[PDB]
Structure formats: C-alpha cells, structure tokens
Design a protein around this ligand. Sequence first.
Ligand SMILES: [K+]
Ligand SMILES: [Mg+2]
Ligand SMILES: [Mg+2]
Ligand SMILES: [Mg+2]
Ligand SMILES: [Mg+2]
Ligand SMILES: [Mg+2]
Ligand SMILES: [Mg+2]
Ligand SMILES: [Mg+2]
Ligand SMILES: [Mg+2]
Ligand SMILES: [Mg+2]
Ligand SMILES: [Mg+2]
Ligand SMILES: [Mg+2]
Ligand SMILES: [Mg+2]
Ligand SMILES: [Mg+2]
Ligand SMILES: [Mg+2]
Ligand SMILES: [Mg+2]
Ligand SMILES: [Mg+2]
Ligand SMILES: [Mg+2]
Ligand SMILES: [Mg+2]
Ligand SMILES: [Mg+2]
Ligand SMILES: [Mg+2]
Ligand code: NA
Lengths: 197, 144, 229, 125, 49, 68, 145, 96
Amino acid sequence: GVDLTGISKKSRVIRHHTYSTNPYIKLLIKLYKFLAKRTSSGFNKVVYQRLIKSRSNRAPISLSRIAVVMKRKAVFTAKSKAAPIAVVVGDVLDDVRMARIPAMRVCALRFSKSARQSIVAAGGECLTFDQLAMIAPTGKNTYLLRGRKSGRESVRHFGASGVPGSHSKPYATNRGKETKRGRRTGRSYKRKAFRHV
Amino acid sequence: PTRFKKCRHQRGSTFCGYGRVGKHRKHESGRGNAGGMHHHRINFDKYHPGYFGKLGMDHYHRKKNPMWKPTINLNNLSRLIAAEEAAKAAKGGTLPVVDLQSSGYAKLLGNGHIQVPCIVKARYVSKLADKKIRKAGGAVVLQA
Amino acid sequence: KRAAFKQQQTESFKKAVVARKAAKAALKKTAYLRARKYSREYRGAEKKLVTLRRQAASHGNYYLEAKPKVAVVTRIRGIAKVNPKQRKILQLLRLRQIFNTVFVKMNKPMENMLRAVEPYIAYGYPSLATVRAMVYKRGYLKINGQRVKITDNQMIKDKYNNVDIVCAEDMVNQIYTCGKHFRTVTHGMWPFKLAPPAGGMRQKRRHFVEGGDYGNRDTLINRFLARMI
Amino acid sequence: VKPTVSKAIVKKRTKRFTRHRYELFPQLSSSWRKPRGEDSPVRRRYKGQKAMPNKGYGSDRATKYITPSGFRNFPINNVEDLYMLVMQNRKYAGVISHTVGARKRKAIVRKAMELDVRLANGNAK
Amino acid sequence: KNRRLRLRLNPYVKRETAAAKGMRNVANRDARRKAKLARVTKAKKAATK
Amino acid sequence: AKSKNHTNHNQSSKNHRNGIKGPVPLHLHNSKRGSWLPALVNARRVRKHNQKAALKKRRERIAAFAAK
Amino acid sequence: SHSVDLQWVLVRQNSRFLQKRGGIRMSNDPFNNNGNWTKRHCGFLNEKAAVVKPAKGGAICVTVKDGSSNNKPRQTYKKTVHAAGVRASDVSRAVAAVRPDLADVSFRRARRMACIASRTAKVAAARKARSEKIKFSRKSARAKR
Amino acid sequence: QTKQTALVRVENVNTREDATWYVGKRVCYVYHGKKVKRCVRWSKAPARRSTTRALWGRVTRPHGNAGMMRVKFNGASVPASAIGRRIRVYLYPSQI
RNA sequence: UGAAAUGAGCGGAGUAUUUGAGCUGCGCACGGCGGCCGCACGCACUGGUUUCUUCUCCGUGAUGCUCCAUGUUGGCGAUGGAAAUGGGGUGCCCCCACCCGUCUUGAAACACGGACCAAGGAGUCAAACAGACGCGCAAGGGAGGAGAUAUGCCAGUACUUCUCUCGUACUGAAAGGGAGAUGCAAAAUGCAUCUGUGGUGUGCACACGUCAAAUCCGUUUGAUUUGCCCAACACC
RNA sequence: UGCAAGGCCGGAAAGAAAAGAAUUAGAGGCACCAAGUGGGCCUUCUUCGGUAAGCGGAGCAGGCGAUGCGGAAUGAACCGC
RNA sequence: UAAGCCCAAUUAGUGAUUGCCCAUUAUUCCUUUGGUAAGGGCGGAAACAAAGGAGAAAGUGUAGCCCUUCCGAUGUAGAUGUGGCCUGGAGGUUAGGACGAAGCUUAUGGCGUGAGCCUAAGAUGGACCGGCCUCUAGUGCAGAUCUUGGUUGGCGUA
Ligand SMILES: [K+]
Ligand SMILES: [Mg+2]
Ligand SMILES: [Mg+2]
Ligand SMILES: [Mg+2]
Ligand SMILES: [Mg+2]
Ligand SMILES: [Mg+2]
Ligand SMILES: [Mg+2]
Ligand SMILES: [Mg+2]
Ligand SMILES: [Mg+2]
Ligand SMILES: [Mg+2]
Ligand SMILES: [Mg+2]
Ligand SMILES: [Mg+2]
Ligand SMILES: [Mg+2]
Ligand SMILES: [Mg+2]
Ligand SMILES: [Mg+2]
Ligand SMILES: [Mg+2]
Ligand SMILES: [Mg+2]
Ligand SMILES: [Mg+2]
Ligand SMILES: [Mg+2]
Ligand SMILES: [Mg+2]
Ligand SMILES: [Mg+2]
Ligand code: NA
C-alpha cells in the first residue's frame, strides 16, 4: 500500500464532452476538436473548451459591449490594420441603448434577429464558426469575447442574506414580507451592511 | 418520469438513502414552518431576516389600477418608434411622436443618453428626463 | 504512385532518420568521454584520501574525514498508525510506501527531518556502487507525469535538457558527489521502488544500534541496499 | 469456413457467482445479489466464504465474447440476414433464433452452406 | 546485469571491465602486491626519518 | 439517560481534511472603511484627482498614438 | 444543403439499416461493402458510393453512386461492370474512381464474390446428384405464361 | 495450504545440497483407477493398457534445510489422496 | 521459432586503440622542521614508456495504421458404439469455513424477526420555490381563457390576440421621488459634446517584439515585454 | 525641498550568492446544490473524581466503528500489514 | 546432553559479512477496470481474382475506431455515473409463428465481472410474438409476530 491521503481532493471536475443534443453544436465540436489537436493555436483550444460548455456558462453578450471593447482596441491599433473579428462562443443580443455602431465582423453561435439586423445595417457582417475556421483557421487577428454573468438573478440570490456584510436577495415571493426583525435597528436588530474580510 | 428517479436506483438498498440510524420518520421537525423562533431560529434568521414582526402603515382596500405608473428611460425610447421613423429624426427637424400611455407607460424616467430625438407624450416625467430631452432637441408634452 | 504530400513526408522522414542516427552517435561519444572523466576523478579522489591518511598517521596525527553530503533513505514500515508530523515528513521525503528509497542532502534541515521520523526509515551513506546499482537497475524518470524506466541516454538528455546531465553517469555523478544539480537530478527521478531485503531484517521495531533496523546505520546501509536492489 | 485465430482463451473464472445461501432456500435463485447485511460474512470478505464479482474478473479484451469454436455469435432470423455475414464470415457465426420454424430453417441452412457462412446451430453435417 | 542495456547506458563499461580483469590477473596481482608494499614501506621509512 | 457532553477528539482531523486554508493576502480586501476619518477624507481627495489625471493621460496617449 | 456529416449525426444511433443484435452493430444497407456500421461504409448515406455485388453466373457487378443525381432515387445508382472473369484489381479500380478510400475492401469483396460463385457451383452439383438419387414424392412446378 | 505446490521427501536426500542436485528432475505419481482408459502407446503397445495411471511434474526448488523438495505437477495439483504415498523421482533430465 | 532477430549477443571488416596495473619527468598541490627535505603515485601537461592486461570499428525506418497467421521429435487421432479439449453432474481426499436479516460502541450470541412454496407487497401524484443540466426566443419572453375555420374526423394538429403575466428600476413607513460618459466649470434643476469601457490593480485570446529548449530546419513549446485587455475578482 | 497618503517617471534586481543555508506523488484561487452524521467505543502518553472497577470525566494522537488478510491457540480495538 | 531461562550465531578461530518457513505487504510478470490520464495513427501506399487473411469509425459512454504508455483499484451511512440489466403498455422501425407463438421443464451448453442474454432438448404446450430507437408506468422481493391460497415435520403421534 501507498499513503495517498486525500488524493481524491486533487481530482478536478472538468467537462470533456457536451451534454447538448444539438447536432450542429456537435459538428462544430468535431471541427474545433480537430483544429485544437492539429494546430498550435491557443484560440482554437479555448474555442473548443467553450464549445463543450453548458449554456449557463456561455453567457450572452450585448452588441453595445462588443462595440465599446472594439473601440477601445481600435484606438492604439494602427489604422493600416483591419479591425479584428469579434468572436463569442455564445449568443449576441441586440441593445436598444446604442443606435450607432461601426461596421464589425462578428462570429457567434447564434444571433438574435434584431442583433443580426443591426450589425448588417451598420455595415458589418455576421459570421458562423465554419466560415471563421475557413478564413481564420488559427484565429489570427481575432477578439475572443465573453458575455457577462455577474448580473444574473441566481448570482444575486446566492448566500445567506442574514449574515453581516451580505447583500444577497432572499428567496421570497412577497416583497413586503421579510422587512422586519433582522433588517431594521428598531426591530430587535439589523444585519450589518459591512464586515471586514 | 418514474424510470429516471432515485427510487429505481434504490431498489435493493433497503434504506433508500435515509440511513440505518436516523430513519425516514414522519415529521421529525414539525410540520411546515413550525418553530421558526424555537429550534428553526438559525435557519429563519440567517436565510430570512425580517420575517417576523410588523412594519408601517396599513392601506385597506388597495386598488392597484389607480396606482398604475410604469416607467421607461430616455435611452430606451427607441423601443417605441417605428424603424424607418428613427432615421428621419434629427435635432432641429421633424421628430417622431411617442405617446406613452398607449404603449403602456406613465412616466418618462431619464436614465442614460437618449438615442433618437423625439416628442414624448407622458403623464409623468422626472426633472432630469425633461431637461435631458430638451437638451437633445426633443420635448415632453403632458397627457392624461 | 505516391502523391505530393506522401513524397513530402518521405523526404522529411528520411532526413529525420539520418539526423536521429547522427544525434545518437554524438550522444554516445559524449557519454563515453564523461564516463572516462568521472572514473578517473573517482580513482584520483580515493587515492588522494589514502595518501592523506597515510601522511597523517605517520606523524601521530589524524585525518578527519569530510562529513558525508548525501544520505540514502529507505522506508521500512507500512502505512498504518502514522502520526500527522511523521506522515507529513514522509510525504515530503516522497517515502509514501514501504521500501521506497530516495537520496537526500545530509544538511541541517534534512537532518532534523530525518531525525523526526527515525523509527520509520533506515538510512546511511551510499557508496558509488549503490548509486550506480539504483540508477541502472531501479532508475525511473518523471516524464510527462509518468514513471518511465531509464533505457538509454537520449531519454535522460531529453528529460533534463541541461548540458551537465545527458547520460546515466552524469546522473550518477551528480547524485554521488552532491553536485550543483543534485536537486534537479533527484527531483527528476521517480522515487526508487525496492524489493524487501533478501535474507530478511533483524528487528524493524528496534534501532540498528539496539540490534534492530530503523536507525542511521552509516555505511552498512550499502549491505542492506545490496540485498534489497 | 475457418475462424480467424486468436490467442488462448483464459477465462479467469469458470465458477458462477451465486447468491449467498441459495442452496438452503428453494425459492432463492442462484442469480447474483450483492449482500448488504451489516454482519454478512460474504460482504465482509471472510476467508472461507463465497467471492463477490468485481472488475478484476473481467475478460481479456482480445478474447472476450469469443465462443469455443472461435466465432462470435451473431443472431440471424432470415436468409437475407446472412448477406451481412457473408463478408466477415471468419469472424461472425450465425445463430438461428429459437422461434424460427423448421421450414425457414431449411432455407437458411441451404443458403448458409452455399455462402460458406458458419452457423452455430445449423445442420450437423 | 543485462549486457546490451549496460553498454547502452554506459558506453565506457567495456574499459572498466577490462581494468577489473587486469586487476584480477594473478601475475599482475602478485607483482602489484609486492611493489605496492615495498613502495609504501619506503615512503613511510623516508617520512619517519 | 446520562451520556457524553464534550470532546474535541476527531476535530483537528476534520479541520485538516480540507486543510486549514491560509489567510487572504493583505493586498486583497484591504478596505479602509472604519479607519481614522481625517486621513480617509484626504486620501479620497487625492484619489479623485488621480482618476482625473488618468483620464487626461489616456486622452493624451490616444492623441500621441494617432499622431504617428 | 445537408451534409453527410449532419446525416451521420442524425442516423447513427437509429436507422432502419442499423442491426444491433446481441452487442454487435452490423448493417444490412445494400450499398455497404462490409456490413460495418460506420460513416465510411454507409453507401446509402455518402454523396459518392460504390458497392461490389454478384450477378448472374460468375459475373461481378459494381453499383456506383456518382453524386450527380442524388435527388433522384431511381437514377441515383448505376450498374457499370456486370462482367465475368474480371480481375479483382479491375473491380478495385472501378470502385476507386468514385471512392479511393473504398479500394481495399472492394478488392477483397470482388475476390470473395468469385470464391462464393465457385463454391456455390460445387455445392449445387453435389446437391443435384443427391437429389437424383431420391424419389421425391412431391414436386412443385411454377405456372408459366 | 496452497495446493499448486507439493512437498516431497526423498530417501537418502537429507540436505539442501542433495535437493539442489534434484532440481529440474521429472517426478511421477503412480496409482490406479477403476476402469482401463487411454494411455500413451495405446495402439502401439496394447500390453500397456491398465487401470494404472501416472501424474507427472518437476522439482522446482529445495524446501528447508533437510532435503525436502518442492514439486510442480503438470497442469493440475496432485490429488490429496497421494499424501503419504510413493512418489518417483527419476534421474532425467540429466546434467552429468 | 524470425511475419522489423538493433547486437560486447547478429552480419561485415582491422590486428590494431587505449584502460587499468607497474616505474618515471616538470612543476603544483600534499606532510614535518622552519625553503630544506620528503612525497605513499593526488591535479595539470589527457606527459613518457608498454614490462603485462583488454579485443575495436562500422551496419538495417515503418513504402508496417492495426490484429491474426511460420520450428523439431514421438503419442493419440484413418470418420467411429471415437480421439481430444472445455463445460455439466455425483462421491471422495487434504486444507479452508460460526446463522441470516436487524438495532447497536460491540452479535455466532443465552438480543429480537426467522417451517416451505406460489402470487401480492412499500419514495407516489399534485401544487409553490430554488439549483444543475437540455431546448427555443431575447430587452423581451410566454401564456391562459376563448374564438375562429381546415372541421361538418378530429379530446389531436394547424391559426389568432385583445389583453394578462414577469422582466427591461428601485427606493421610502408614507406623502412621494427616481439612476450615462467626457469636457468646461462650480450655477440650491449650470452649459457644450457625444463612436462609447468612470478610474486603478490583478487578469483568456489576439497583435508587436524578446528569450530559452527541441527541431525532420518547415516549424513548436514554455516563459517574458508592450498594447488592448473579454469573463471575473479586489479597492475606489 | 521635512513627515503621511495616492499615483506617475525611471534605475536595480546572486529572482535570492557564500556559510550543513531545505523539501515536496508542491497548479493556486472562487462558487453552486445536496446526503448521511449530531448514542460512540478502544489504545498510547497526560490526567480529574472514586478504595476500586471491563467505573465515571477531560487533553493530544492513532485506531475499531466502516475491514478484511497474516500473527499472538482463542479475542472489534494488540503485533504485522 | 530441553523442545526451559539469559545471551549469542548461521553451517563456524576455514579464510569474511542472505540457514530456514509462512501474508490480500514489497518487487516483478500477465489480465481487467477507471483516470485531473499521456502519446501516436486515421488524405485508404503501390500493386495483388478461383483452381497471406481481415480490419482501419476524428471517437464521453458499445463487441469500447485502432495501437502504445503510466498511475490508482477495499469500504458501513451516504452521494453520483453507466450506447448498464430486467418487467407491463405507447409511438416508430424491423422480424418471427401450425414445418408450432406465449407459458412451463433442465447434469443445456455458450456468452457476460454482474444484473442477465442466447442456443439446444422437451418422448411440453396449443396461438400468438421477438429485436432495435424513442415514450410511458400500479416496473425487479428473502424476511415487515407482512396479506391470501396451498403445502408441511411433529404423526399413524396426543
Ligand atoms: K486505460
Ligand atoms: Mg434526521
Ligand atoms: Mg523477524
Ligand atoms: Mg509499535
Ligand atoms: Mg463465466
Ligand atoms: Mg459491524
Ligand atoms: Mg451525544
Ligand atoms: Mg435492541
Ligand atoms: Mg446495548
Ligand atoms: Mg448479526
Ligand atoms: Mg452468551
Ligand atoms: Mg425490538
Ligand atoms: Mg451536507
Ligand atoms: Mg453505526
Ligand atoms: Mg490467528
Ligand atoms: Mg492498469
Ligand atoms: Mg470500490
Ligand atoms: Mg449504501
Ligand atoms: Mg400498468
Ligand atoms: Mg407495486
Ligand atoms: Mg433484503
Ligand atoms: Na414471492
């Protein structure tokens, strides 16, 4: 026998195949598993890992965030060079708060219809991942992008709301209930807004 | 469906995941929300602060229709304009008209930067919304 | 016949074979010179020690030997009923199994670590023969996290990618003289996995000084390991 | 047809794993059941008790499912089923289903003899 | 113990074995024994004086 | 009946099962909330000025890059 | 519009050609040279396909899917050799024109068909002699028109 | 006990050195059944047909210090009804 | 059993190179007494010699992706009331071997339930909420009820939506208010502009270089600089 | 121009020498959702109450419980593993 | 003249430093299975009929695409996975049956680690029913002083 105390602690849970039933996601996973094995690109590797991920972990992105980050990159980029292709393994959603966007090349798993319309009407084009594999087989001159997940309602509800320094939302159907003892100084006590970590 | 549940996996395990020592007994904590101040106090206090006690004024015979007051911000006004109209709109020119109450809105709030100048007919408008839309070439017209 | 890509591959592979044969011949020549140099160094060092001892003895003086720099430590107990401190030390020594064996530097930190786990180990000072026997017969490398038997010098050279470690005798010399790459070489090896001593032990529960087996037994560790290797 | 040759079949264990103490109760079948009794001497692995099945008893991948004749049994029901066996006829033998009647069996055996497709339960000669 | 492997790892092993064989030669051994004893005794007697 | 009230016997084993996690580095979570108020107020003024200087510096950097 | 990749993803687990019997996955697809259930051997699926079949007598027939009329099932498959005594390598080259990745298996299948035809001749002759020894109380004659 | 290895005591073999001499030699256990079954040279030499049977093995190593030898029988363990019965140790395969 | 014999072992060539042992040169180290001695065969000159002791030098990619198939000598086996091997059955031998289920710190227990067999026999359905995972659409999603007409066979499917709901805003006990950035400035509702991360630290990819290693010389695999930094975290 | 604090601009960094001058079967962080437990008992050292107990109560650590195998004839916990 | 106690050896003042016997341990070999697994191959290489063969799937999971390599493998309560087993019905798709379906019987073999599957034989039966994908549920028994029916030793006894 060999002393391996809690060696099971070092094993890590990693998705190695997709739970998706979508046949086209499976075709894309085939393509990019081949590209990640047979090329030196880090872009292909990360695209493959994201392709096998769960939908919750492929957060959607807004068109406005894409435009803003592409602008921050466009300055300090030589005006000789062309703008990178923005790549998101996920969904692109339209944004009503940004009417005026530049011509952008975007590759996404899916576009919302209004997002696709806005991108095209601004002069850009909507790509799929097979076209991207055709014209950027190693992901040269690309901008890999992720959507936001920290504003999610589930994230806002995580953790006990009655411990000092917590500001999580409680699981409650009635907003007016649970506004008393424990939340006001005049009702016995109030849970502290701040605690030093 | 029945074939996917833990009961199928437990056929032959005798205890079905509830243990030999602590059994699966009937109501070992009491029923429902019993003992929220006695023996469930920590659960209630750490996950549902504010649950016990009273607060504020009563309002007998609350009618929600007289209180109907939905809001929309300045940077969302383009949701209520036809696609061709938002383009023929410009400061100093002929502007589209938005009537809020027929779109389901009572108050123009005024968060963000307005995207399409327009004339907005609102029952209510915040002071910042009014000033901000006037600076952009639009206007607010009160309605009832 | 074979298309363009097949002919590309055959040209490239022919060049690969030629380059591999040249690399093998060069590595063999290098290993030969280094082994000759090390053999002469060992013989000369022992002869100088002999002369120093003779000169000290001839005038009523003494020759204090240099403190041994390297210890060879083998675990001699199973994995049951080990207290937390001893468990942690044996894990840091990579002695996770009975008759697992390692080389350590015999400095103050390692010395106190060895003292703390005295009843679990048997250790001493390895001769050159012992180091050679362990590397050649029981030597394995950590290659890609896999325990791989040493079978040629190309595996050693590829593993270490360092000019001073390209052959078996380079590792033997680094281990034996506590060279500047001692940690690199020993850390790059899998812990040695030995058989029980043929002929048996005396008493694993008593110190070697008491007629048992678990102490520091100085150079008699070489007899022990000879029966084990 | 001769089957393709494989290495020696080992068959790690030829005894069946039978249920604990089924020899004593007529209603208990010998089908294996993992003993879960807290004091069970079989579950606790006392030396003289029955063994329990586990992964280390699994057959060599290379000789698994190979019948003593050297073929792998493929169930067939028809004359037309033999055609997918016609190409890999040194690897797979055909087993005529038990419910296939004697008349259709006559036809199947004639065609299989013609095709050189081995049948596990055909005619003796 | 295996010959191909020992020579593959240490190409120089043939020469160490040749040296060991030369050392185990009874004529060479006896001559060395005589010469070494005489030489070391001469060195000792020279140093002691 | 009468039974055992207290023991710490298995507790350090449990605590070490997932180990005693070490402390957070000092450069993380170094909130100044609740510290001496005058110094806090002065430091806030300096921080506002430094944010303005960062904005101007980025604007100047953009202009100088666009010059090339 | 819809690739062989997608169609293979769609039909791999479930198809009227997949014969999963015991634990063995064979295929009774007519355009499968092997009976193996792989995307390579699915002649019914692939855009271009070729299968070696037996013909009347000692002839060997090659059926070819050239992919030009895949939307027309009656025209999809074409008989192209139907020749007797062809070299197995000739069948192999006829198959390799549409699918070089099927060359080896189709060569072997040509040889197997030749062997089967000769063997059937021998078995039939022996059975005929045995039959000529027997009285055979009943004999059915198909109506002719 | 582990029945795959039998222990044999040979007359006049009373040291580990003698048992070493016998290492590798063929070993035979002769008995009889009830019926006459197939033997070697059943067709060539029908006078060999007998209820008599033999089980063969080889000495693998000595056992202890006093001349006992370990024996491996071909394929199957020797029957326990042979305990205390005669065993033949032949002089072949020979080394002299 | 040569269906890759990778070799000091196979096949070719040479009678030599060189590694110890010897006894020797110059210093330098090394030991006494303070440069004079010695020097045990230490280091460098890979010194000289060779008195004796070794053998040394070349060679085979895979145009093999995988698996399976090749010797010698007898015995038995020549188509049968058969020879083999495996499986199955019963007895015997030598070793092993406490009664299951359960509660319990602890059961073979003088702890309880346990004559046999058949059939029957226990985590279900509904509602509310949450998390994970699948699917559609997305700043919007979706009904429900009900109508319409294919529709007079058909409790299904196809179609509609006026609304309704929960989300795009949340704060205050309420009266009631209600969130962009940059710039200038500092007006108790301040002006202008708007293609834009509020700032800072840490931070994928990618883009510029730069190293080290390995290279079949094409490349690739680790790190690192600078820029932007996506997600995210921490301070503002 | 000193002290404090936040930044910016640079320089230097055996990336930690030498003196016994570490070692690692040495990827750190961050979450989410749940089970069973919440009668213990034994041993080693340290012990408190008790004349004492196979008694009662604690500290540290290994165990049995949940675990057989080899050994002490036999034994949950001893030795070995 | 221990087969007892204390001490000390390993074939004995000879010429050196392993007497011997037993583990689910150690070392090593073979096989399985699972990884926080590690690498290769996968553009059919060229030719090749009967009187060297076959295979080669871009793949979590299968009879696992195929090959190589390393490491781990026990476990109550408990958690989770499984092209894991099984049963009654439904939508599909493929079959079988009077030349004998279901059921039932077994020194009745074969396959699987196993749940089980499949064949054979009925000197059984008499009319329905198997496989595969998906859907669905009143879906798996050894014990509850368990329910109902039948049997049973005690017993040719009291
Ligand atoms: K594996
Ligand atoms: Mg409970
Ligand atoms: Mg002992
Ligand atoms: Mg002890
Ligand atoms: Mg079996
Ligand atoms: Mg127990
Ligand atoms: Mg308690
Ligand atoms: Mg009780
Ligand atoms: Mg009790
Ligand atoms: Mg019990
Ligand atoms: Mg009792
Ligand atoms: Mg009770
Ligand atoms: Mg829990
Ligand atoms: Mg318990
Ligand atoms: Mg015992
Ligand atoms: Mg393994
Ligand atoms: Mg297990
Ligand atoms: Mg359990
Ligand atoms: Mg039902
Ligand atoms: Mg039921
Ligand atoms: Mg049970
Ligand atoms: Na029953």
